[PDB]
Scaffold this active site. Structure first.
Site, PDB file in Angstrom:
ATOM      1  N   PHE A  81      -9.540   2.714  -1.842  1.00  0.00           N
ATOM      2  CA  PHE A  81     -10.179   2.261  -3.064  1.00  0.00           C
ATOM      3  C   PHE A  81     -11.625   2.722  -3.119  1.00  0.00           C
ATOM      4  CE2 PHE A  81      -7.079  -1.544  -3.196  1.00  0.00           C
ATOM      5  CZ  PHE A  81      -6.150  -0.787  -3.878  1.00  0.00           C
ATOM      6  N   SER A 116     -22.444  -2.996   1.693  1.00  0.00           N
ATOM      7  CA  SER A 116     -21.987  -3.090   0.307  1.00  0.00           C
ATOM      8  C   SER A 116     -21.931  -1.742  -0.402  1.00  0.00           C
ATOM      9  CB  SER A 116     -22.929  -3.983  -0.464  1.00  0.00           C
ATOM     10  OG  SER A 116     -24.192  -3.365  -0.482  1.00  0.00           O
ATOM     11  N   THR A 165      -8.217   2.532   9.560  1.00  0.00           N
ATOM     12  CA  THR A 165      -6.911   2.575   8.889  1.00  0.00           C
ATOM     13  C   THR A 165      -6.168   3.933   8.992  1.00  0.00           C
ATOM     14  OG1 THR A 165      -7.969   3.101   6.772  1.00  0.00           O
ATOM     15  CG2 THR A 165      -7.633   0.767   7.326  1.00  0.00           C
ATOM     16  N   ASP A 194       0.814  -1.204   0.000  1.00  0.00           N
ATOM     17  CA  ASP A 194       0.000   0.000   0.000  1.00  0.00           C
ATOM     18  C   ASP A 194       0.858   1.268   0.000  1.00  0.00           C
ATOM     19  OD1 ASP A 194      -2.022  -1.966   0.494  1.00  0.00           O
ATOM     20  OD2 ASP A 194      -1.708  -1.715   2.648  1.00  0.00           O
ATOM     21  N   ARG A 241     -18.837   3.723   6.198  1.00  0.00           N
ATOM     22  CA  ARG A 241     -18.641   2.418   6.813  1.00  0.00           C
ATOM     23  C   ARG A 241     -17.280   1.899   6.376  1.00  0.00           C
ATOM     24  NH1 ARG A 241     -22.666  -1.053   9.102  1.00  0.00           N
ATOM     25  NH2 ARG A 241     -23.894   0.882   9.022  1.00  0.00           N
TER      26      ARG A 241
HETATM   27  O1  LIG Z   1     -18.559  -1.482   4.801  1.00  0.00           O
HETATM   28  C1  LIG Z   1     -17.663  -1.459   3.934  1.00  0.00           C
HETATM   29  C2  LIG Z   1     -16.330  -1.333   4.315  1.00  0.00           C
HETATM   30  C3  LIG Z   1     -15.347  -1.314   3.329  1.00  0.00           C
HETATM   31  N1  LIG Z   1     -15.702  -1.417   2.036  1.00  0.00           N
HETATM   32  C4  LIG Z   1     -14.691  -1.386   0.976  1.00  0.00           C
HETATM   33  O2  LIG Z   1     -13.604  -2.262   1.286  1.00  0.00           O
HETATM   34  C5  LIG Z   1     -12.352  -1.594   1.080  1.00  0.00           C
HETATM   35  C6  LIG Z   1     -11.586  -1.493   2.404  1.00  0.00           C
HETATM   36  O3  LIG Z   1     -12.035  -0.364   3.149  1.00  0.00           O
HETATM   37  P1  LIG Z   1     -11.463  -0.089   4.620  1.00  0.00           P
HETATM   38  O4  LIG Z   1     -12.122   1.147   5.192  1.00  0.00           O
HETATM   39  O5  LIG Z   1     -11.525  -1.386   5.392  1.00  0.00           O
HETATM   40  O6  LIG Z   1      -9.925   0.265   4.316  1.00  0.00           O
HETATM   41  P2  LIG Z   1      -9.504   1.414   3.275  1.00  0.00           P
HETATM   42  O7  LIG Z   1      -8.994   0.611   2.108  1.00  0.00           O
HETATM   43  O8  LIG Z   1     -10.756   2.214   2.990  1.00  0.00           O
HETATM   44  O9  LIG Z   1      -8.471   2.193   4.058  1.00  0.00           O
HETATM   45  C7  LIG Z   1     -12.655  -0.229   0.473  1.00  0.00           C
HETATM   46  O10 LIG Z   1     -12.509  -0.293  -0.947  1.00  0.00           O
HETATM   47  C8  LIG Z   1     -14.098   0.015   0.843  1.00  0.00           C
HETATM   48  O11 LIG Z   1     -14.744   0.816  -0.143  1.00  0.00           O
HETATM   49  C9  LIG Z   1     -17.065  -1.543   1.692  1.00  0.00           C
HETATM   50  O12 LIG Z   1     -17.412  -1.641   0.500  1.00  0.00           O
HETATM   51  N2  LIG Z   1     -17.994  -1.563   2.646  1.00  0.00           N
END
Ligand SMILES: O=c1ccn([C@@H]2O[C@H](COP(=O)(O)OP(=O)(O)O)[C@@H](O)[C@H]2O)c(=O)[nH]1
Length: 365
Positions: free
Chosen positions: A256, A236, A192, A110, A188
């Protein structure tokens, strides 16, 4: 008080959309130029001297060595994150037939590798998905555009298939018209970065204004990872689209989440201006999204959500343009051709002859 704020945002908007020029002369962007400024500035530190064979072997410590030789792909046997290598390789493989030889140090972590504050050791070139002005890493379209993004309950093989995600969110976008979206700020996700706390704390203090909860990630250590609250469920991407005001925060690096948030035709609140993926440069604040400085306060939030709840026609205009941008200039076509032009301008910098290397494994096609 309320009026001072009201105007400041309005001037900033009026000013922004008055200043805006499209990323390309025609919407089809036939010459693949929409994000051409980014790859341009990114390679620049190498234009004068070029890339030496030395620079490469030095930089190899910073990621996964890919090598194109005689239109065949070669890669370090050990890839740190196998699924991420698969996401990138989906993109490299169809190009290899029409590319000259090159050596690539591709970082699949990352976090970027080449800190500009250090010198000489971190000259590069190294390819990363996300960086700041601090880093000399060359930016590329992340693996997650095809496969290997975060593994979750809703995405057990890790989030990917942007081609498929686009069609899916597009339907859901059309199904839930603006007025039917709940007038709540939404989030949601997992803890991080502590830039996310204030929204989560505000949500606990005012759920009627903000619906925001921390989820659990695979790196969970203690109660602190959710500010001492029970881990909420993953919701989702389609289910985001029922809220008017959707927040996007950086994580380890850039998240993302962003690209998906736009296709909801909801108003995207993007916090922080440091962390980038390749396409961000062309995402313009107040045109496409609401900008917010890193570490926003609960009071910043109330004022900004209160402003847009009180300027519904204005909010919608932004949501719409934000949606259209990701729709028009982040198609799989935009991804593949950025890959293409990037490598083509990169190969030209190389001041040496690419020789094959035995320890490397044959990837394809
Ligand atoms: O309830 C959720 C939580 C996360 N995500 C997706 O899963 C990935 C991981 O998100 P997280 O916040 O865990 O870490 P980030 O990559 O955002 O720092 C991202 O692409 C989010 O858009 C999602 O679709 N729904």
């Amino acid at each position: 008080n309320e009026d001072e704020f009201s105007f400041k945002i309005r001037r900033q908007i009026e000013k922004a959309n008055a200043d805006y020029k499209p990323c390309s002369s025609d919407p089809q962007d036939s010459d693949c130029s929409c994000h051409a400024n980014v790859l341009k500035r990114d390679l620049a530190p190498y234009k004068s001297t070029g890339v030496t064979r030395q620079m490469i072997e030095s930089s190899a410590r910073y990621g996964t060595k890919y090598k194109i030789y005689g239109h065949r792909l070669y890669r370090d046997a050990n890839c740190m994150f196998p699924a991420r290598c698969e996401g990138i390789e989906h993109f490299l493989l169809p190009l290899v037939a029409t590319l000259p030889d090159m050596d690539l140090i591709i970082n699949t972590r990352d976090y970027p590798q080449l800190n500009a504050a250090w010198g000489n050791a971190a000259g590069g070139p190294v390819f990363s998905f996300s960086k700041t002005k601090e880093y000399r890493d060359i930016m590329y379209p992340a693996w997650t555009f095809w496969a290997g993004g975060p593994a979750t309950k809703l995405h057990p093989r890790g989030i990917g298939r942007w081609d498929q995600m686009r069609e899916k969110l597009e339907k859901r976008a059309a199904a839930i018209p603006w007025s039917q979206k709940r007038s709540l700020g939404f989030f949601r996700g997992s803890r991080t970065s502590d830039e996310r706390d204030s929204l989560i704390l505000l949500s606990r203090r005012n759920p009627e204004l903000v619906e925001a909860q921390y989820t659990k990630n695979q790196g969970w250590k203690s109660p602190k990872d959710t500010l001492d609250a029970p881990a909420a469920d993953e919701v989702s991407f389609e289910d985001h689209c029922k809220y008017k005001y959707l927040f996007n925060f950086r994580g380890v690096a850039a998240s993302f989440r962003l690209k998906h948030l736009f296709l909801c035709k909801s108003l995207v609140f993007h916090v922080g201006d440091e962390w980038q993926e390749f396409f961000y440069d062309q995402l313009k604040p107040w045109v496409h999204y609401v900008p917010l400085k890193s570490y926003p306060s609960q009071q910043e939030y109330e004022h900004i959500l209160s402003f847009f709840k009180k300027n519904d026609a204005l909010a919608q205009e932004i949501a719409q343009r934000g949606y259209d941008f990701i729709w028009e200039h982040l198609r799989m076509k935009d991804i593949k051709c950025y890959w293409r032009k990037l490598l083509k301008r990169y190969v030209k910098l190389l001041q040496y002859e690419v020789k094959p290397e035995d320890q490397l494994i044959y990837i394809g096609p």
